[PDB]
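Response to reviewer comment R2.3. The reviewers asked that we include at least one raw input/output pair. We reproduce the pair for Burkholderia Lethal Factor 1 (BLF1) here without editing.
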Amino acid sequence: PNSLEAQIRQAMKTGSTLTIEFDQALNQKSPGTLNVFLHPANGGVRIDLDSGNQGEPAKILWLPWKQGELQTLQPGSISTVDMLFFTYYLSGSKVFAGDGGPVWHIDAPVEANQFWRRMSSDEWMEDWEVGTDRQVAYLHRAGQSDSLWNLSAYLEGAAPSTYGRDNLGQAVVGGIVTGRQQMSLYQYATTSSGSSAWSPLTYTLQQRKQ
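Raw output as returned:
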């Protein structure tokens, strides 16, 4: 087989099943580029900071998760074509990504009006004029209280993507850099069947309402 990094990139693009396991240690690393180690795992790859167990070093874009908080990948970090992007598992959390803009990982309990307000101070958001469009990929857990995710007051366009059902289930989000400040996003979800194959996480046209 190829490098583990190549195997992940190929699984994403082909819509194959390849799971990702993250060491919680990764959440103590800042958003941006990160040197990690990839290891074979049953059915997938484990990403950690351990150079042992048939580890292969890789430089990725990384977005940590933090309890009760937003974390932000700033787009200036994004430069190397074909570099992989990952964020930590989604277990009730939300991911919001602007195309050519930041990616935010927002913990589950942060209400939508609150996280929107927090997102709102980023230069990309301030440059997003009311009444104009961006492309946005937004993923939340199905059956979670809408107070924690619904942005309908702020965005007019396609409904968000969802993972899970009845506020149960997990997702993994990653990406592949395609150009300066630009990525294509990919996802899978883990339910009582197991883990799904990778699919695209689509940016959809949204008009800013207010």
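Residues 1-210 form one domain. The two ends are 50 Å apart (CA to CA). Further pairs are available on request from the corresponding author.
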